[PDB]
A paper describes a structure:
The calcium calmodulin protein kinase II (CaMKII) is a multi-subunit ring assembly with a central hub formed by the association domains. The AD hub, which evolved from bacterial dimeric enzymes, extends the β sheet to form lateral contact interfaces (LCs) needed for ring assembly, while the ancient dimer contact was preserved as the vertical contact interface (VC) in the mirror-symmetric two-stack hub. Linkers with variable length and sequence between isoforms and developmental splice variants, connect each AD with a peripheral kinase domain (KD). Here, we present near-atomic resolution cryogenic electron microscopy (cryo-EM) structures revealing that hubs from the α and β isoforms, either standalone or within an β holoenzyme, coexist as 12 and 14 subunit assemblies.
We expressed and purified a recombinant form of CaMKII comprising the α AD fused to a fluorescent Venus tag, separated by a flexible 15-amino-acid linker. From a single sample, we obtained two cryo-EM structures for the CaMKIIα hub, a dodecamer (12-mer) and a tetradecamer (14-mer), with 6 and 7 ADs in each of the two stacked rings, respectively. The Venus tags were observed as a blurry density around the hub in 2D averages for both 12-mer and 14-mer. The 12-mer and 14-mer hubs were resolved to 2.7 and 2.6 Å, respectively. The 14-mer hub has a 12 Å increase in diameter and a larger central pore compared to the 12-mer hub in negative-stain single particle 2D-class averages of holoenzyme hubs. The superimposed structures of the 12-mers between α-isoform and β-isoform had a root mean square deviation (RMSD) of 0.35 Å, while that for the comparison of the 14-mers between the two isoforms is 0.3 Å.
Author numbering:
A (entry chain C), B (entry chain J), C (entry chain D), D (entry chain I), E (entry chain B), F (entry chain K), ...: 345 to 478
Write the structure that this text describes.
């Protein structure tokens, strides 16, 4: 019951990221959120300004078929207020010439229940970049 | 006050890992702990059996000079029970020929206050492997 | 007689895959089927959703000449209900510029006779990816 | 109950392979067993003569620490006589200089219950070679 | 108060460089300014003639989206007349095909308060070149 | 006269670094000194603890012939309290086999006259690492 | 006299292959013919179905200038019924941009005089592939 | 019966080559024998002087374990006087450090029954060189 | 006074080379002039015929922006008749796609005052070729 | 006098080759002429048929500017009937994009005075291929 | 008869070179002899001083087994005084570890009958260097 | 007569450099001498201090056989006081394992007759470094 809620909210976040829906993304993310990801080049970025660039330039333009598979999710519940979820992500997309391609990443997300709703406080990503290479 | 406690416990964990003190490491880690790290080759490993190999074969034998610098730690407190810490780690070591070398990693750790003491539930590492290459 | 049936059903499966006939493919595959293949990047995928992407985007569009040769098939019969077949597959195709190309794979397939008809339960592929590279 | 038996026999086979115990290996393997593996260079080898070389020259000499982790096993039962098991394998070993190393493979095994005991009829391996590289 | 002034003037300089506004750039730079940068190929260039080429040919033509993030600025005040600022710079841009890309540089700038206004006397840059590669 | 003083103090600092004289180095460096250098891997390090490792392990052991040439020094004087010096540095050394080798770096140093004596507040280095590679 | 006949029939076969004349090729080849060639990827292919693909897609379309030189032919006559011929083959062709290119192969052919006419039973080719690369 | 004789004589030749028994090799080979092999660098060598070097320097000194597997032999009988045999060859050996290694070759051999005994007239080899690389 | 004359004549020569003005170039060069340059591939070329090709085909056609910086010129005067000048040359240009690029060369020129005017007798160039690569 | 004649005839041959004048080339070449050149791939070709391909396809079509420089010719006269000439050849040409390029070769030519006129009997070329690469 | 003499003298020269017999080599070579060879780096060397280094340092010390095969010699006779010979040379040797190795070269030699004995005037070599690489 | 003097003094300088005779080298070099060479990494070095390192560490220790060939020297005389010489230099040496090696450089030297003796004022070197690589 409690783990299904975390899985559901993570699925909502992933679907919002896929569609370039920056409004929903801003709604589910904490203002002070922190991130490790391949695009930051080893640095820790804070806030949502760093990620708005990719929504504006990549997600809000591209609409080609993309399929996402979430493998072996694991959830840690820390009281009734906070949770952590870690999983593997396989993304199938199409390159410039229209040839199917696949990429893999490992992702961790930390959720806090602020004022009655779940919000990401930190997230760490490894493996393939979010920007899909041809 | 509360962030200093997390910094202190993280420093204790790092120092215990450096010295190959598997007893302290087992004391600070949750039995169900999960890990993402370069050595797992993209897989999520559970338990402490995976890490005991490196204590037995690397940390419990090597004693050459190693210096660790922790850069830009950031801490999220989620109530009074749980916390998350993210930082950059620079490690200076000596290779096989005795030439100084440096490596960088990005690390996240999730702490839960179980039965009055902090314990790692999940951790995610990126960048250089823990096993120092020559 | 019994080995010829397995060879025939494997040929039907291969021909259905070649033509992008997802209906027949779904008919010959078990709902709980598992797969190892180069496209999964070392992971074990379950179900038919992972493979539907390539039918939608590769097999249901491309129609260029493709020739398939099956080398040294070997069949193990396990009672009257189950069988296993292992073979080498050589595929001749045309790249982007229209130059003939060849690729090789090694393939194993496990068939179970459910409710009177054969169905794949597991399959493992090595070598060249199914997505033909230029 | 029935899946635990397959897991147990697979663990016995893996432990026997680790120790270079060619007698047990010959006991659990069918005389007509077939194999796909990286060492065969894309060919299908039959019988146990191909594998005896590595028992004689690698397993029966080397005794350095090796740790094996089996990830996400999946089992298909085909009646009461036959079964198939597919899993990921992580192997931690020591190279020539004594530096810890890790390797990953994907493995499928087909078991038949002949005359009251389980025996491998076919097996397919992908990823790292069994011969551990430095 | 005094560090905020240096941060503000550095932001003005960066924004002027971004827009290809050579007039403002010439206004903020000392005539005898010196520079280390990747484009000089290990040499120390003096004056503003070396940099006018890139304003004429790159900044005064290109207008595609560019986002700049300044990480961990550190400021040294040397009396009331001079200051030094060192920081990391992350630049997000679009390559030839329109794919988002990121680059990192480390930058130091020395400011002198001449005749009541701040002016750059020397600057040293490392990492990615200013000319954004595809 | 005033530029000769800066050149002299820079020569003293370089000679002290060459001889592994950590006492003199600590004497000439400000406690809050900051540094960009290739060994930090793109990060800004503060304090003298990061550099003590190389004095302990490289400069305090090695004593092979090393020759240093300083090319085209340029000096900016900012009042009577602060100065900046930028130059090219050629280092001739011997590798592991005893073969002469040469390396080049570009270096900037910022000096502040605190309590009547010059002290480094910041320094930025590019090109070859200080640790001489074979 | 008898060696000239083998040379003549080999020349006829080569000319028929050059022109994409699959009818003549089928006439000169035994139904059970076997082949080693670079395109088979280390496998032994039997029959003429493997080679029909290249006649259909490469020889029956391309008509650009091609020049063939046969170097140092050697012939072994085994009775009055069978012969073997081994030679070097240099092929001059034009790539995609129209630039002359050259390739070399080593070729062996085994001829049997069945029902009064010579027919290839086996052939082995090394070196450059028949499919001419740009 | 007649194909078994060719298989037997080929096995004798391979075993004689393995043991460095140049006398038997000279006995089974025709004086005018011709050869294509990787060691000749694309040239056709005649006689047995080219191969005597490897018997003198490699086969007559090395005695480490070597295992040979012959895959998918195919035989063409041309009357009662001549035959041709084509097969794949897998060789397992030990490199300089004692690590097991495997190599693959494709081989064709032409036998003529002179004065009542079989003799090689021509042979063509592809793939791995006979000289085993570490 | 005398060094300024050499600097002036060298600037005239460089400007004439930049504009593809072969007449002025021929006027400033001795008929027996010799040259070392990267385009000669390690050979010493004599006369002006070798350089006329690049005037005809490169300088007399291209007119895109090019900026030249001369660094650290050094002049040796040998009596009143002859001089030598050595300097570093940085060239900023635009590649095929219009991206700014930079190149560096080291250049020596020997001037003789024949019949009252200066003329190049020999010149030696190292580093980047004169033909600007994209 | 006698060396000038050889130089003249060599210049005529080179100019005829440059213009794609196969008639003159055939006139100056002996029917039994032999050649070593990079295009033959290490083989010795006899006759003029091998070279006619490049006249037909390269020299008889291309007419872009090409400049040839002959460096350090050396001539050996063997009686009044035969001579040998060896020289270096620098060729300046234009690639596909119109960028000047240079290539170097070393060439030897053997001339025999048959029936009162000089004819090439053998020639050996090293270095760059005659077919000019972009 | 006349071609056999040239073959004999060439064999004598090759055998003398193999044994490091600089006296015989000097006896068979003309004082003004010229050479193209890979060791000269594209230059034409004159005299015997260049080759004496390799006799002193390589041929006069090494005595390991070396086997030479001469393939497809071709001879042009120019009157009764001069001749030219061109051939392929295969050399089998042993590297540093004692592993057999093979190399190929193409060679031309020009002989003049001075004062009643044959002498080399020019020679041109391509392919592998004479100095055998491991 | 006058060119022979320059050749003689250049030979003396080269022989002095070969023997590590720093006294003679200092005697023939001007105090203000300038140099371009590969070891300076694109910089112009002044004085003899830069070159003393290689005399101390390379020439004054190594004594293995080295042979030098000077190809195609060209000399320009500028009055009776100054001269310039340009040539190619081939150096034959022995690497670490004792294998002969060859290197090529292009060199220019400017001589001035000061107080009755010739002295180098400038020299420019291209190609192989003076420090001989294995």
């Amino acid at each position: 019951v409690r783990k299904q809620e975390i899985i559901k909210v993570t699925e909502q976040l992933i679907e919002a990221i896929s569609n370039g829906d920056f409004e929903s993304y801003t709604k589910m993310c904490d203002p002070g959120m922190t991130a490790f990801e391949p695009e930051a080049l080893g640095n820790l970025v804070e806030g949502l300004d760093f990620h708005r660039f990719y929504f504006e330039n990549l997600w809000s333009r591209n609409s080609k078929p993309v399929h996402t598979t979430i493998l072996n999710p694991h959830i840690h519940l820390m009281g009734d207020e906070s949770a952590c979820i870690a999983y593997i992500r396989i993304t199938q997309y199409l390159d410039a010439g229209g040839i199917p391609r696949t990429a893999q990443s490992e992702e961790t997300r930390v959720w806090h229940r602020r004022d009655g709703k779940w919000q990401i406080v930190h997230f760490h990503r490894s493996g393939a970049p979010s920007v899909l290479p041809h």
